[PDB]
Amino acid sequence: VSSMRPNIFLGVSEGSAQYKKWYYELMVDHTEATHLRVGWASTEGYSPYPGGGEEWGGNGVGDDLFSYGFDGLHLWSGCIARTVSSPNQHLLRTDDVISCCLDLSAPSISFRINGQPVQGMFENFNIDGLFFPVVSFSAGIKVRFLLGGRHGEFKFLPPPGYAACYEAVLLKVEHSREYK
Ligand SMILES: [Cl-]
């Protein structure tokens, strides 16, 4: 299991914050046991290093208390699966488009699948740190972030009040993979 993320970091501050609600999509270009989870993680989940260093771990989305993932059937956090429902329900597969929503004002993390709402969302979790889009996947799986911006246009309209993640570009994708 590998992971990818863009360099987009969203969070609370004491400055101007016209947008507290953030949206992106993931397109699944190819799927062939397997793993494919998408959602968000916080920098509070970084691994500590000597001298105060903190590093992204690149682990499975929802396999700790700092990340929040959807796989088509379940929501994941803290290594535990919650069952959710949707129309036409399936584990993620080729040509699925997953919408990911982060509402820092609620707080909530919620999803759509091929434009339809997933019934069940994350609530009652902390919003310490900065949040980033993130996906994790087993071998051979091909996915793309659609962040907004001319090279990653959305397939669906963001919900009212939501901003494209591309607007928070202060754009690169990082991929973490096992070495061995
Ligand atoms: Cl890979």
Residue numbers in the entry: 652 to 683, 690 to 827, 832 to 841
Please quote the paper that reports this structure.
Ryanodine receptors (RyRs) form ∼2.2 MDa calcium release channels located in the membrane of the sarcoplasmic and endoplasmic reticulum. Triggered by either cytosolic or luminal Ca2+, or by conformational changes in the skeletal muscle dihydropyridine receptor, these proteins govern several Ca2+-dependent processes, including the contraction of skeletal and cardiac muscle. RyRs contain three different SPRY domains, named after ‘SPlA kinase and Ryanodine Receptor' where they were first discovered. RyRs bind many accessory proteins and small molecules that affect their gating properties allosterically.
We solved the crystal structure of the mouse RyR2 SPRY1 domain, encoded by residues 650-844 (equivalent to rabbit RyR1 residues 639–833) up to 1.2 Å resolution. The core of the structure consists of two antiparallel β-sheets. A ‘lid' region, also observed for the SPRY2 domain, forms a cap over this core. An insertion that creates a β-hairpin protruding from the core distinguishes SPRY1 from SPRY2. This ‘finger' sticks out from the core, and is stabilized by the conserved Trp713 residue at the base that forms an anchor point. The conformation of this finger is identical in both molecules of the asymmetric unit and its residues are highly conserved among all three RyR isoforms, suggesting it plays a functional role by forming an anchor point for other RyR domains or auxiliary proteins. The SPRY2 domain contains an ‘insertion loop', which breaks a β-strand typically observed in other SPRY domains in two halves. This insertion loop is not observed in the SPRY1 domain. The SPRY1 domain is located right next to FKBP, and the top hit for Repeat12 is in the corner. The corresponding residue in RyR2 (Asn771) is involved in a hydrogen bond network that involves Asp753 and His747, the latter of which is directly in contact with FKBP.
